[PDB]
Amino acid sequence: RRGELGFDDMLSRLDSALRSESGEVLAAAIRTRFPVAMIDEFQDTDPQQYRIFRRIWHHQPETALLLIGDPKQAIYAFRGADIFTYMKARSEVHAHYTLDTNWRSAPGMVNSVNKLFSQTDDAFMFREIPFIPVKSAGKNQALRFVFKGETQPAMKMWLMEGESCGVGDYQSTMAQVCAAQIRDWLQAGQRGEALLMNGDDARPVRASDISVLVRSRQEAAQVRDALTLLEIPSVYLSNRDSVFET
Amino acid sequence: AETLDPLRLPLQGERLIEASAGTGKTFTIAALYLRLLLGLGGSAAFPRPLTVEELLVVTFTEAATAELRGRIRSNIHELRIACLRETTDNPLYERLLEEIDDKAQAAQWLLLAERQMDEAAVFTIHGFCQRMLNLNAFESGML
Amino acid sequence: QWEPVLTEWITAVLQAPLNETGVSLSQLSARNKQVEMEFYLPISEPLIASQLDTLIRQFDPLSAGCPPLEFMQVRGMLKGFIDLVFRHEGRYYLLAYKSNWLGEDSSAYTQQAMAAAMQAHRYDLQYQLYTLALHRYLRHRIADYDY
Amino acid sequence: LLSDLESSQELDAFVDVTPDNLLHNIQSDILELENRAVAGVNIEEFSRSDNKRPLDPLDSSITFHVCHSPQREVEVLHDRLLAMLEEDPTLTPRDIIVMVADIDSYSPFIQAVFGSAPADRYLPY
Amino acid sequence: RQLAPLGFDLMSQKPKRGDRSRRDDDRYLFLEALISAQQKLYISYIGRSIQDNSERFPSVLV
Amino acid sequence: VVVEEFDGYRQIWRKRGVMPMLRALMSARNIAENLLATAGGERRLTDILHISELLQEAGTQLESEHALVRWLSQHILEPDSNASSQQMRLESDKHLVQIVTIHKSKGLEYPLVWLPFITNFRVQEQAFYHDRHSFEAVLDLNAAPESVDLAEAERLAEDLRLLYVALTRSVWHCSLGVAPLVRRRGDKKGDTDVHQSALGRLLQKGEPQDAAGLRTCIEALCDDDIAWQTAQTGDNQPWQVNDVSTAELNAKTLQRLPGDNWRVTSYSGLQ
Amino acid sequence: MLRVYHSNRLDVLEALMEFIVERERLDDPFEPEMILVQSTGMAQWLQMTLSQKFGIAANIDFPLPASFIWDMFVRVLPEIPKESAFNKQSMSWKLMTLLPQLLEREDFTLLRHYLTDDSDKRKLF
């Protein structure tokens, strides 16, 4: 009645247009428009989007479809994405291609990730999501986070000691342990003891290098309160609060 | 599964690329864009070379689309310079220059791609849906 | 309801001649008339009000009263829109329209009241700039021109 | 379309521009219809770099500026226009033009940064 | 500034010499702005985002 | 004197607008220098500047002067989040510890990453799952246990994907916080709920164990890259500032007037 | 004779127009001088430059090329009204009446599928 439109209303209108009988010819017009498609971030794909892309580019000749994505990064299920659509797409298509080389992290962290996720079979508990061991880069094989004592390992699982603990006490103890490790890295980093070494080049660890990865706002405020007690300033990048509420 | 080479990918039918975390996905996308522009691959190539306004790239995040458009523009300019000079400093650009036999027609096509880079068909999902609803409004029934 | 009185008033305006010889508006052809002449007048000196108002009062007899207006030094261009310019028997004439006339309803709009309105609303500077613009226009257009 | 006319009389009055500044260099390269871009087909042309045109470091004719917001952009532009007015003693703000891609988006920021200047800093807009 | 065509217009299908488009008009406007500048040319564009500090690329003409 | 200068501020606000009045207020009172001299006042100054920019952006679209005050009071009373009305970063030069959620860390890069709450999990209660054959969204309004189990399986798969996203963002070093967390209300029941989480499904191989079993499963996968240590509660000293001095800087001053009185006017301009 | 004046800048063309006007005077003083422009700022700058060169700039008409072409159509060929019957709004209000009458044809089935689904006289206009 008002004539307005929404973000998902465009997808619903295109799916209803391709659902009709004449709109198939419209799909041929799309085959006249772009005889190719390269779809990035296919893990964040609604079923309407995949129904459209199957309506246009299923089996027609001279048109190519390239679904470039990652099933191990589909974390937007709260937004509307769905991994079962990706499993249906993997069951429908025939060819699969993967990227072997990893250019970001040190080979110690890569070996830790390939060791932790390949303990059992089907670690993602689904049959259509297999895990493969990725390979580290040749240019980044000399990355070392060195401490005052010796070379610090990649993954350090700080096991909190005790039989049974609550939620708030565990969060407070692990926030205090993280703040103590942060202040130890900053106290030894300003004297040239804790370093980041690429081959022979060295860099002291500043406050911008250490980052705490949380999941909720309450535990982020807990980390910020446990870190501001030791005279360490910290920023919250995920702060979406309005300026008018201050 | 098999390993993915950007200069040996058959661009026929439906293909599923699984790019892991930290891999060069935007570089592989730019390599496949240059492959679709110049028409490289031999037997696994496209039947005809396409222009900039015929390659459709769909990415969800708008900043990712802007970064990919800027990177593809920079790659087009670098490949045009490397084809005019018959030399480059990148090994993938070296293999791209080794795959082509002609240099003048490829340089003219890269110059026309640089001039038509503003009219590139690299949009988002909702932007592509709105453009298809506004373009063919008769068969769809959109205002 | 105003329409049948307005048209006879318009013809009463058109029947009234406005000249020193008695020339009406119906004797003017389409090529002789020119409505809404827009002119641009340049000035490269800083326009001093004290050097201009005294030059006006030296020759204009209506500047006996009318204490001088104050304005800043204006250097540049001046826009103007003359209502009507028309020639007749080889002589050019200017015509402007003023139609507010709120304070008069009787026949008191004589030459004294019109001169008082010209002194109050300060239309003397506008008419002098119109005469200067028309003199420059007839000098630029017509060769061998005399004012 | 103009050259296709049969009874057309073509007259050319082109005043040549002496190439000294960078903007005058660009205008002379456009008027003379020549290609000054060095591609470097050989390694001898790629090694040496003196075959191009020398650009003086004090030549502030063409400058490119990177800003972070529409407010900071015109805030930088106002200071740069003040520096340009201070650099030349004979320079009129009428001879200065500012063109924006969208007038309605930037016009609040332009009015904000042009009204906030004090009396010694205010230029009319 | 890009203005998409109506789609069912026949002038966009078979272009002639005297046809006018907004993209070519904007490119000729940039050329006339380059030529019409006598003394100084100033160009400013948004390069970094104010929200997430993302790199914003300039136009193809610049 | 304060009432007179506030009446002058009202005159500037009625003639020139919002930002000229705010700039004259911040220049006459010199509150910006006092907020920059105070430690922790730079974020307040950036918030004041953003509020001033938003008030200037909203003041041009409104004719009345009280309408902007009503709009500001309404936007104070309305905590709705727009893309323009969000808080920005306060400083960029000073290095700070960047706390970032797992969804906002997708595609980024960090040298050292600390994960203190990677063992905390939450059980999905509602029965909204997907069929394993038709791959369609099935919403079960009745409390059937099969739908609850099929939704908890998808919740555990989402938690494992979040664990892989959070693990694959470190470059040099990542640290994990492991603890025998029990979601059940019983304190000492002989078993912990780490097998109900994403990390314990890989540590304990999808089997319920105890704290000693979790410790043996941690110590079983010990390599050169993977190590463990106990949590030590202790603080010695907060930090050292090690500040440095600032060099001298000055501002240029314009010598003359910017322009003469050049304007193209009419007769009405001279009257 | 159609005279075409090619020049690099606009000041040479303005000086040539000034020299043309001062060289050949008009026989009719009340005849307007047709200078075809596209925008109002171009006509304003031309008026200011002609006032600077001549001391005055009056009775100079700046019409559109389409308006001048239709005026020459009226002046040359008789029995033609001053306004065209085929305008944008006139053809729109004509086609809003004509399109429901032409829906029964076979060639207009696409517009019938676009229009006869739901219509509160919004898609038709």
Side-chain angles (χ1 to χ4, degrees):
Chain A
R1 196 260 306 176
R2 293 185 176 182
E4 300 174 349
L5 208 66
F7 306 104
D8 301 331
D9 291 331
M10 309 170 181
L11 302 162
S12 74
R13 276 283 192 173
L14 191 56
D15 187 71
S16 300
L18 293 182
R19 213 75 169 184
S20 59
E21 186 169 2
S22 62
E24 159 68 31
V25 191
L26 145 78
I30 303 179
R31 291 193 291 268
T32 324
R33 198 59 180 179
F34 318 109
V36 85
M38 302 193 301
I39 304 164
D40 191 14
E41 303 288 333
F42 204 62
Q43 55 269 0
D44 304 332
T45 302
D46 303 329
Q48 304 175 0
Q49 307 176 3
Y50 184 63
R51 272 155 54 184
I52 286 168
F53 294 146
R54 194 185 175 270
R55 194 90 173 95
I56 305 169
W57 290 292
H58 192 48
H59 287 336
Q60 288 83 6
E62 99 175 2
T63 64
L65 192 72
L66 305 180
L67 318 170
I68 306 178
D70 195 9
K72 305 175 297 299
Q73 288 184 351
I75 61 180
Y76 293 90
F78 72 102
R79 193 186 47 85
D82 175 46
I83 200 53
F84 283 77
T85 57
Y86 187 83
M87 290 190 273
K88 184 193 301 179
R90 193 171 187 267
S91 301
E92 279 186 6
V93 306
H94 302 337
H96 299 327
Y97 304 93
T98 44
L99 287 177
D100 195 15
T101 60
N102 184 23
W103 308 88
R104 184 194 305 271
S105 300
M109 224 287 299
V110 173
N111 286 137
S112 173
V113 167
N114 296 139
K115 186 63 178 179
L116 185 56
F117 276 87
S118 301
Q119 293 288 147
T120 179
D121 179 71
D122 299 358
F124 291 93
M125 85 184 300
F126 287 155
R127 295 300 308 270
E128 290 85 8
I129 313 178
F131 183 75
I132 47 177
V134 297
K135 195 175 300 180
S136 60
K139 64 173 183 66
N140 300 119
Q141 64 182 359
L143 297 181
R144 286 188 301 267
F145 167 66
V146 285
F147 220 174
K148 36 181 175 181
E150 61 269 346
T151 60
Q152 198 72 22
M155 197 173 70
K156 196 176 188 183
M157 296 178 295
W158 290 88
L159 176 59
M160 201 270 297
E161 197 68 32
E163 302 291 329
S164 180
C165 179
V167 180
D169 305 359
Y170 146 78
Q171 280 180 359
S172 301
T173 48
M174 291 320 291
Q176 189 174 359
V177 164
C178 180
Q181 279 304 308
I182 285 177
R183 75 166 179 88
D184 284 1
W185 291 347
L186 288 181
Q187 185 180 325
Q190 59 183 359
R191 301 191 304 266
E193 302 175 357
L195 297 176
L196 305 171
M197 296 188 59
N198 183 25
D200 294 330
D201 304 330
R203 176 191 176 182
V205 269
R206 300 300 180 180
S208 60
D209 301 1
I210 305 110
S211 61
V212 181
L213 259 59
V214 301
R215 202 177 62 180
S216 178
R217 191 189 292 105
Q218 179 183 0
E219 59 183 44
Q222 176 69 218
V223 165
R224 191 176 181 179
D225 290 0
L227 200 55
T228 195
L229 191 133
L230 305 182
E231 213 181 357
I232 300 177
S234 60
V235 78
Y236 191 25
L237 298 183
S238 304
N239 189 22
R240 307 167 286 102
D241 194 13
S242 180
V243 207
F244 292 139
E245 217 178 351
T246 61
Chain B
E2 302 178 3
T3 171
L4 174 67
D5 294 332
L7 278 80
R8 294 301 178 181
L9 177 64
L11 306 179
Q12 289 84 5
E14 300 177 332
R15 312 297 182 177
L16 180 58
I17 292 176
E18 182 179 359
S20 301
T23 65
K25 180 178 62 61
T26 326
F27 177 73
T28 317
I29 291 174
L32 292 182
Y33 203 95
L34 295 168
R35 174 184 174 90
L36 276 166
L37 278 181
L38 295 181
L40 261 51
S43 60
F46 223 74
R48 55 183 186 96
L50 310 183
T51 60
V52 200
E53 55 184 355
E54 298 178 355
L55 304 189
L56 176 63
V57 187
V58 178
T59 322
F60 178 72
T61 316
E62 186 206 9
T65 59
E67 171 257 2
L68 182 48
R69 187 185 294 106
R71 182 159 275 98
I72 285 176
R73 166 67 164 86
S74 179
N75 281 269
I76 282 174
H77 187 51
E78 283 182 3
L79 191 51
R80 177 181 171 269
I81 289 179
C83 190
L84 284 177
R85 294 175 177 173
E86 282 80 22
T87 175
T88 181
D89 306 330
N90 190 270
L92 189 130
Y93 280 76
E94 179 182 357
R95 299 186 294 108
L96 280 176
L97 289 176
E98 283 178 4
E99 276 201 358
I100 328 170
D101 47 355
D102 194 11
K103 303 302 179 181
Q105 187 67 218
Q108 188 68 31
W109 287 355
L110 285 171
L111 178 58
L112 290 179
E114 183 179 359
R115 293 177 184 181
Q116 287 289 146
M117 200 50 195
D118 180 55
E119 218 181 2
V122 185
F123 308 129
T124 56
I125 318 179
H126 307 267
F128 171 73
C129 290
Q130 181 68 28
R131 187 163 281 100
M132 289 306 113
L133 280 161
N134 296 18
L135 188 67
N136 308 331
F138 292 152
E139 297 89 2
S140 60
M142 188 102 281
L143 282 163
Chain C
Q1 57 179 0
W2 249 278
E3 175 259 321
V5 193
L6 191 62
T7 173
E8 63 95 8
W9 169 80
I10 282 175
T11 57
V13 164
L14 293 185
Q15 279 177 359
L18 15 80
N19 206 30
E20 46 93 14
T21 52
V23 178
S24 301
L25 289 171
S26 60
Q27 305 176 1
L28 310 175
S29 63
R31 291 301 179 90
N32 295 18
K33 298 176 303 182
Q34 196 68 31
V35 196
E36 306 297 322
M37 178 167 77
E38 39 174 0
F39 64 92
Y40 280 69
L41 185 64
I43 164 175
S44 180
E45 295 183 351
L47 190 54
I48 304 136
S50 299
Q51 295 184 1
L52 185 61
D53 186 71
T54 55
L55 190 60
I56 293 309
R57 202 171 299 180
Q58 189 183 359
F59 290 92
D60 176 65
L62 297 179
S63 187
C66 191
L69 24 75
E70 301 177 353
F71 56 93
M72 312 66 63
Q73 298 182 357
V74 176
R75 179 178 66 101
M77 277 74 182
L78 169 74
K79 293 183 61 180
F81 281 81
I82 298 181
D83 303 5
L84 184 59
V85 184
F86 57 93
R87 61 159 184 257
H88 183 83
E89 60 181 1
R91 182 154 295 184
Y92 305 93
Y93 295 92
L94 199 143
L95 179 59
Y97 298 143
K98 304 298 179 178
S99 58
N100 173 78
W101 218 245
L102 52 91
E104 304 293 325
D105 60 328
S106 61
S107 59
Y109 31 61
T110 59
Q111 196 172 37
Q112 300 92 5
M114 285 185 295
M118 289 281 297
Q119 290 179 0
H121 289 176
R122 250 300 180 181
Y123 294 148
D124 175 64
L125 179 60
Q126 183 185 2
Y127 127 89
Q128 279 150 350
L129 288 166
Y130 284 171
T131 52
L132 180 64
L134 191 55
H135 169 77
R136 289 192 173 188
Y137 177 72
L138 298 176
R139 185 180 61 180
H140 171 56
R141 187 57 57 92
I142 294 104
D144 193 70
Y145 160 72
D146 182 70
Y147 180 75
Chain D
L1 288 181
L2 286 196
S3 60
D4 207 9
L5 302 174
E6 302 175 357
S7 60
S8 60
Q9 180 72 26
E10 36 181 4
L11 307 181
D12 49 334
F14 287 89
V15 171
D16 196 10
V17 37
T18 59
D20 44 353
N21 299 22
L22 184 70
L23 175 62
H24 285 339
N25 275 309
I26 294 301
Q27 289 182 357
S28 179
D29 293 337
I30 290 178
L31 178 63
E32 260 62 39
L33 203 60
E34 58 180 358
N35 185 25
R36 292 296 182 178
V38 176
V41 194
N42 45 319
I43 34 91
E44 190 265 352
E45 205 79 17
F46 179 72
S47 300
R48 283 293 182 176
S49 315
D50 48 76
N51 56 322
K52 303 181 180 180
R53 314 178 68 91
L55 174 60
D56 301 331
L58 299 180
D59 193 10
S60 60
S61 61
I62 296 184
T63 50
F64 303 95
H65 292 244
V66 167
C67 307
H68 288 59
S69 65
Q71 174 83 2
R72 187 50 181 172
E73 176 174 357
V74 206
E75 192 176 5
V76 163
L77 167 64
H78 180 267
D79 300 0
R80 289 311 299 255
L81 285 185
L82 232 78
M84 288 175 181
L85 286 176
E86 199 184 8
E87 192 175 4
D88 295 330
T90 61
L91 184 58
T92 314
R94 183 175 46 91
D95 303 331
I96 305 179
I97 194 180
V98 174
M99 286 181 292
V100 209
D102 191 72
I103 174 64
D104 301 329
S105 56
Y106 278 77
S107 178
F109 304 99
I110 290 173
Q111 184 180 359
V113 305
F114 282 168
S116 59
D120 60 329
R121 208 188 303 173
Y122 175 73
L123 41 92
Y125 69 102
Chain E
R1 301 165 297 183
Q2 299 183 7
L3 182 59
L6 262 54
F8 47 88
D9 168 66
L10 300 181
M11 298 177 58
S12 60
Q13 306 292 330
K14 185 180 298 180
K16 273 191 180 183
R17 298 294 183 177
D19 300 4
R20 295 182 55 182
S21 60
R22 198 178 184 90
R23 179 180 177 270
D24 300 358
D25 284 2
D26 289 0
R27 293 174 83 94
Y28 197 73
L29 270 180
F30 194 82
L31 181 67
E32 283 181 327
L34 177 62
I35 292 298
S36 159
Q38 294 182 349
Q39 300 180 357
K40 289 181 181 61
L41 178 65
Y42 180 87
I43 289 180
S44 188
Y45 57 93
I46 299 180
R48 302 295 297 183
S49 180
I50 207 60
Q51 213 67 34
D52 303 327
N53 291 21
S54 300
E55 182 177 359
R56 300 284 298 271
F57 290 91
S59 179
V60 203
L61 318 175
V62 195
Chain F
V1 170
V2 164
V3 164
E4 173 66 35
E5 70 174 0
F6 264 84
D7 197 11
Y9 294 152
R10 187 182 62 178
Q11 288 294 138
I12 293 300
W13 147 267
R14 288 172 66 253
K15 288 175 183 178
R16 305 268 281 269
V18 202
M19 193 67 67
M21 184 216 71
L22 286 164
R23 202 61 55 92
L25 175 56
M26 289 173 60
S27 180
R29 288 289 187 175
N30 205 18
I31 52 182
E33 186 183 15
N34 303 330
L35 285 183
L36 285 180
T38 314
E42 204 273 341
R43 163 82 278 188
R44 156 167 45 181
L45 188 60
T46 55
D47 289 326
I48 283 174
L49 258 61
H50 199 184
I51 285 164
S52 299
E53 286 179 3
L54 290 180
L55 280 176
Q56 223 292 320
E57 191 186 8
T60 59
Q61 303 177 3
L62 299 182
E63 177 181 354
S64 178
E65 291 86 6
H66 191 35
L68 189 58
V69 188
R70 292 181 179 179
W71 178 90
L72 180 59
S73 65
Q74 181 181 178
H75 271 245
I76 283 175
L77 289 180
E78 289 178 2
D80 59 327
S81 59
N82 293 21
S84 181
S85 61
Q86 284 180 2
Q87 292 184 5
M88 310 171 304
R89 186 179 179 179
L90 47 134
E91 52 187 351
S92 178
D93 178 70
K94 296 298 182 179
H95 304 271
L96 306 178
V97 181
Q98 297 179 349
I99 312 173
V100 50
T101 51
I102 320 292
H103 304 80
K104 284 291 299 298
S105 176
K106 185 177 181 180
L108 292 186
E109 182 177 357
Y110 295 102
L112 311 181
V113 174
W114 237 97
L115 299 89
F117 321 116
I118 208 54
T119 337
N120 183 28
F121 67 98
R122 180 169 167 179
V123 183
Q124 182 178 359
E125 298 89 2
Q126 298 185 185
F128 173 72
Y129 66 98
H130 301 276
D131 186 67
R132 262 67 179 177
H133 297 271
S134 62
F135 296 150
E136 302 180 359
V138 181
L139 174 59
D140 192 13
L141 304 179
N142 298 121
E146 301 91 359
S147 300
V148 173
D149 293 330
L150 260 60
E152 209 275 339
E154 301 174 3
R155 162 221 156 271
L156 188 56
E158 184 183 356
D159 294 359
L160 287 161
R161 284 170 276 164
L162 280 163
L163 169 64
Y164 185 80
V165 165
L167 275 183
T168 53
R169 296 311 166 189
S170 57
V171 178
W172 277 277
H173 179 69
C174 56
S175 302
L176 289 178
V178 201
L181 180 58
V182 177
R183 192 56 62 176
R184 205 170 184 264
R185 307 300 182 269
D187 299 0
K188 186 181 180 180
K189 292 299 179 180
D191 58 328
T192 178
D193 302 330
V194 196
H195 68 93
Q196 293 288 334
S197 178
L199 182 65
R201 202 186 187 272
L202 305 183
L203 288 182
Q204 301 175 350
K205 308 165 188 175
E207 299 178 359
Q209 283 178 164
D210 212 330
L214 178 60
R215 188 173 183 177
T216 52
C217 287
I218 284 178
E219 293 178 14
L221 34 112
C222 280
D223 297 326
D224 301 1
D225 310 331
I226 298 177
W228 87 280
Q229 264 188 6
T230 173
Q232 176 184 5
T233 300
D235 172 64
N236 306 330
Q237 49 181 343
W239 211 16
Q240 298 292 328
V241 36
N242 200 20
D243 48 348
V244 86
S245 301
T246 60
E248 190 181 1
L249 30 83
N250 243 20
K252 294 181 175 178
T253 314
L254 187 57
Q255 314 169 11
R256 55 178 176 88
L257 295 186
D260 209 0
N261 189 29
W262 188 283
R263 44 181 58 184
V264 182
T265 177
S266 301
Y267 162 70
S268 180
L270 299 179
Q271 170 66 34
Chain G
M1 177 183 299
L2 180 60
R3 306 179 187 269
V4 187
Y5 290 85
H6 308 270
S7 176
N8 182 81
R9 66 183 74 258
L10 200 49
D11 297 359
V12 186
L13 292 177
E14 192 265 349
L16 283 172
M17 181 174 55
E18 169 259 356
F19 178 74
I20 282 300
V21 171
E22 291 287 335
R23 167 188 172 184
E24 305 177 5
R25 293 186 95 92
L26 227 60
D27 303 330
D28 192 18
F30 281 88
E31 171 186 347
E33 195 169 14
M34 297 299 187
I35 300 189
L36 302 187
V37 297
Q38 192 69 26
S39 57
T40 60
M42 176 84 260
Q44 196 174 1
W45 184 87
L46 283 181
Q47 271 171 329
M48 287 174 184
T49 48
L50 287 186
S51 66
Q52 187 182 356
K53 246 303 181 179
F54 295 148
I56 203 60
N59 284 338
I60 314 176
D61 191 15
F62 296 90
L64 296 183
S67 180
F68 171 73
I69 273 298
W70 190 257
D71 195 15
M72 291 300 111
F73 285 168
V74 169
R75 287 183 177 182
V76 170
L77 295 171
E79 296 289 330
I80 298 175
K82 60 177 297 182
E83 52 177 2
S84 182
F86 282 76
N87 301 274
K88 181 180 272 181
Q89 303 92 2
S90 67
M91 283 189 298
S92 73
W93 281 106
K94 280 165 189 180
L95 257 55
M96 195 184 176
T97 326
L98 284 176
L99 276 174
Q101 298 180 359
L102 294 181
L103 284 184
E104 313 296 323
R105 281 176 163 263
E106 194 187 357
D107 304 0
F108 295 93
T109 172
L110 188 60
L111 302 187
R112 187 170 69 255
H113 277 269
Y114 175 73
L115 203 63
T116 57
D117 299 359
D118 50 329
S119 292
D120 55 331
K121 295 194 175 184
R122 181 178 290 110
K123 297 186 177 180
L124 177 61
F125 188 81

